[PDB]
Amino acid sequence: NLLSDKNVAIIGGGPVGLTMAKLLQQNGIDVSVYERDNDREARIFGGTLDLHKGSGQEAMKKAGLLQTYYDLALPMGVNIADEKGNILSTKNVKPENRFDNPEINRNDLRAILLNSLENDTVIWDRKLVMLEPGKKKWTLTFENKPSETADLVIIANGGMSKVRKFVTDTEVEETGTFNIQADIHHPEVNCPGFFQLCNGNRLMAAHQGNLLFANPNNNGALHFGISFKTPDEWTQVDFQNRNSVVDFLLKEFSDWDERYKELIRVTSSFVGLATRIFPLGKSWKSKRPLPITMIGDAAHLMPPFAGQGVNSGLMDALILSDNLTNGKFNSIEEAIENYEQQMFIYGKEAQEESTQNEIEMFKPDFTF
């Protein structure tokens, strides 16, 4: 009843926005996703995602996609190593826990979600640049493309979103840590020592404030990340110049075993990213001119040290879609308010845990 003869615009087709769209569409809602990516073949850079029972997996189950996820996800164990390459502990996944949070490639998750939507639900090459509330509909302005209208706008376009001001004046913050990520293709050949160290498990190591994480099998590539407190001199490293990054990393990792150094020396290109947070604090704006809200990283971007990132976003989509379709609310505004009040609770909890882990993980003495 709330959305009958109305349409919904979701801004951003990340995992959270696409899940949003599926959950609305399967209830007969007219919904479009506007995604800035030029088309669906653009690869998504990054590590794997794990969906949790009761949150991310509950969104997939409601959508009819839980088995689809299971079929493309891998449970993976964890090895903790020290800087010398000694395995300090090894924890494999017991078979009764194979469904707790198996890891899925981000492109596979995207494909699962896109395949679940009706044709032309996602409108590619649509970068939203501005919103304007009319008498009853939002007008959406896109970069060099014709405008569109919607009764309800859901901001789902990630942590650096510039279209949040109708919802909140909160600004994204840097937390003081920095991340460098890279993929190694054919790792069994190109970083064989480190690949054997992982031994089919994820690997984590920490030494003198420098952290290293690796997944040796993300659809055949090894993905790794290195994190550290942002240096005071900084960004004096040009991530377009691999020689500049290799030089910086080899100094920081000078005391690490050569299996780690070879990882750095053979990487083709590096991606640098300051850690950021979009902090939940005082309430969002009340009495907005037309119905609008935010989900996912746009709502509560958070340091990736607690593993709660995408799962809290998928809970947003589950809660918001239920409120918009369960027939219990007298207005779209009230369904939104109910979602936001719930999400401020679990969102603040996740953000606190992420921020606490971050403080603790970068203390000079930290051990996993």
Ligand X SMILES: Cc1cc2c(cc1C)N(C[C@H](O)[C@H](O)[C@H](O)COP(=O)(O)OP(=O)(O)OC[C@H]1O[C@@H](n3cnc4c(N)ncnc43)[C@H](O)[C@@H]1O)c1[nH]c(=O)[nH]c(=O)c1N2
Ligand Y SMILES: CN1CCN(CCCN2c3ccccc3Sc3ccc(C(F)(F)F)cc32)CC1
β-strands 122-123, 30-34: how paired? parallel
Closest to 269 in 3D by CA, of 107, 37, 14, 45: 45
Taking CB under 6 A as the rule, which mask of x and - marks residues 13-32 in contact with ligand X?
xxxxx---------------
| Contact with ligand X (CB under 6 A) among 21, 47, 324, 333 | 47
> Distance of alpha carbon 312 from its chain centroid, rounded?
10
Q: In what helix (H) or strand (E) does residue 146 lie, and over which residues does it extend? A: strand 145-150
**Binders in 60-79 for ligand Y, by CB under 6 A:** 78
Q: Does the annotation list 43 as a binding residue?
A: yes
First-to-final CA distance of the chain: 51
The smaller minimum CB distance to ligand Y, of residues 53 and 285, is found at 53
Least distance CB 227 / ligand Y (angstroms): 4
DSSP letters spanning 66-84: HHHHHHH-B---EEEE-TT
The count of C-alpha atoms lying within 13 angstroms of the C-alpha of 33, restricted to the half-sphere facing its C-beta, is 30
**Exposed/middle/buried for residue 286 (C-beta within 10 Å: 0-12, 13-18, 19+):** exposed
β-strands 202-207, 145-150: how paired? unpaired
Least distance CB 160 / ligand X (angstroms): 7
**Binders in 111-170 for ligand X, by CB under 6 A:** 126-128, 156-158
| Contact with ligand Y (CB under 6 A) among 126, 137, 202, 300 | 202
Identify what 340 binds: ligand X, ligand Y, none; CB under 5 to 8 Å per kind. none
Instruction: Using CB under 6 A, count the residues that bind ligand Y.
Output: 16
**Cα separation, 140 vs 247, whole angstroms:** 45
Least distance CB 307 / ligand Y (angstroms): 4
Residue 197 near residue 81, CB atoms below 8 Å: yes
Q: Does the annotation list 297 as a binding residue?
A: yes
Q: Which amino acid is at 166?
A: F
Does the protein bind ligand X through residue 6 (CB under 6 A)?
no
Least distance CB 57 / ligand Y (angstroms): 17
The smaller minimum CB distance to ligand X, of residues 20 and 332, is found at 20
Does the protein bind ligand Y through residue 215 (CB under 6 A)?
yes
Binding-site members for NADPH are 43
Which residues lie near ligand Y (CB under 6 A)?
Answer: 47, 78, 179, 181, 202, 204, 213-215, 223-225, 227, 304-305, 307
